[PDB]
């Protein structure tokens, strides 16, 4: 009736959310990143902004957040606020008018093995180059470049959870149909930081417009 409180107290007595959660500083933090697209909220062509409801699942092993279940009556998982732990600073590079990083700090699920799963919701208003040529029968290829802003590839490595975005919970939109989706990991060198390439995961979605409304009302 009090073992979970004891566990939470023991874990965070001298925990530091600033340092990376690795045993040795020369190690690389392996983060698994899975974008779950819940709803394609809007595709504003005139502003070239795509607004999407997402859950940004991030999974990583925190070396210092292990515990032995037998010490706590078999507790194998706990829920803790994300503000207390170290987190990857995933930033949407192509943000248009939203937030760059996650602002809804939901609770993370911590397991006895140290595995943390964090599934924060976000409303990404990303930039997308709207091709107007074949409008209103156009196919748009809109992308989300997500990556650790300050940690470079030799320090924190992000890997995609699967080759494709998670569309299992995707609410079907009435104007655009996701014909294709795919995620590619890239390493690129910026002029700020010539000695350290930075990793990113570019999710992309080939969405086809449903032209019936525009056929009736315009064509």
């Amino acid at each position: 009736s009090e073992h979970e409180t004891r566990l939470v107290a023991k874990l965070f007595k001298d925990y530091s959310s600033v340092v990376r959660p690795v045993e040795d500083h020369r190690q690389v933090v392996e983060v698994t990143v899975g974008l779950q697209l819940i709803q394609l909220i809007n595709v504003d062509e005139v502003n070239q902004i795509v607004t999407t409801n997402v859950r940004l699942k991030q999974q990583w092993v925190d070396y210092n957040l292990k515990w032995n279940p037998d010490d706590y009556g078999g507790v194998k998982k706990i829920h803790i606020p994300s503000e207390k732990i170290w987190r990857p600073d995933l930033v949407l590079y192509n943000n248009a008018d939203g937030d760059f990083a996650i602002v809804k700090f939901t609770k993370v699920l911590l397991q006895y093995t140290g595995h943390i799963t964090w599934t924060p919701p976000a409303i990404f208003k990303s930039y997308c180059e709207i091709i107007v040529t074949h409008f209103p029968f156009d196919e748009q290829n809109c992308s989300m470049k997500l990556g650790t802003w300050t940690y470079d590839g030799s320090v924190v490595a992000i890997n995609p959870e699967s080759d494709q975005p998670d569309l299992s919970n995707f609410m079907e939109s009435g104007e655009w149909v996701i014909k294709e989706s795919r995620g590619w990991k890239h390493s690129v060198t910026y002029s700020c930081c010539p000695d350290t390439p930075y990793l990113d995961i570019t999710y992309h979605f080939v969405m086809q417009r449903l032209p019936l409304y525009f056929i009736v009302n315009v064509i």
Partner: antibody, heavy 120, light 107 residues
């Protein structure tokens, strides 16, 4: 410096209750956890339970119903009480001071151990 | 929980010899293995924790190594004080102890 001393009856009747007292010296129970282990005759040691520094307790799932652990921080004593004793409880009982790194615990110091034999 | 086995069950070696006791688990122990020395009638003494961290006051001749599911305890030069039983145990998932390796001087 750090020392732990188990004491208790050398022979206990079956179905009676065993009581063991681990006296502590060299450290304060308010800052170090004290675990109880037992080594059955002809078997490897097994973990029985822990009295936490914060005064809480935790027990082995197989022995949770049969075990109680308490402490007296004024006397620096840890008490183990076990009921429904059986022949299989015959073995050497140790109390250990536990070290910690964050939430992970391991047995850092052992007591000398008390032999308990359960026979009618 | 992670079952642990030790080898050899009984080992004979002469004074000064290097000895390497082996401890193998049924699952990845993730270096959360400790070694302690128990003598007949004496309180067990911890030798090594986290597979290589030497306990304060332990002679430097004791060293630990291992990874995954296989670990070893090495005595570079066996002294007469070191004839005892050595137990490996694991504290990452429950608490499990090896059967123990009894070390005797060769005759």
């Amino acid at each position: 410096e750090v020392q732990l001393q188990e004491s208790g009856p050398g022979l206990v009747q079956p179905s009676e209750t065993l009581s063991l007292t681990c006296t502590v010296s060299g450290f304060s129970l308010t800052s170090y956890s004290v675990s109880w282990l037992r080594q059955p005759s002809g078997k490897g040691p097994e973990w029985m339970g822990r009295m936490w520094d914060d005064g809480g307790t935790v027990y082995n799932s197989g022995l949770k119903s049969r075990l109680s652990i308490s402490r007296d921080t004024s006397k620096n004593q840890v008490f183990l009480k076990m009921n429904s004793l059986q022949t299989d409880d015959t073995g050497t009982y140790y109390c250990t001071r536990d070290e910690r790194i964050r939430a992970i615990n391991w047995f850092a110091y052992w007591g000398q151990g008390t032999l308990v034999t359960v026979s009618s | 929980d992670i079952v642990i086995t030790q080898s050899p069950s009984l080992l004979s070696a002469s004074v000064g010899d290097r000895v390497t006791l082996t401890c193998k688990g049924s699952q990845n122990i993730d270096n959360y293995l400790a070694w302690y020395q128990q003598k007949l009638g004496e309180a067990p003494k911890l030798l090594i924790y986290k597979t290589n961290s030497l306990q304060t006051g332990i002679p430097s001749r004791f060293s630990g190594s291992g990874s995954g599911t296989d670990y070893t305890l090495t005595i570079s030069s066996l002294h007469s004080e070191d004839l005892a039983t050595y137990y490996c145990y694991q504290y990452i998932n429950g608490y499990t102890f090896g059967t123990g390796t009894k070390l005797e001087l060769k005759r």
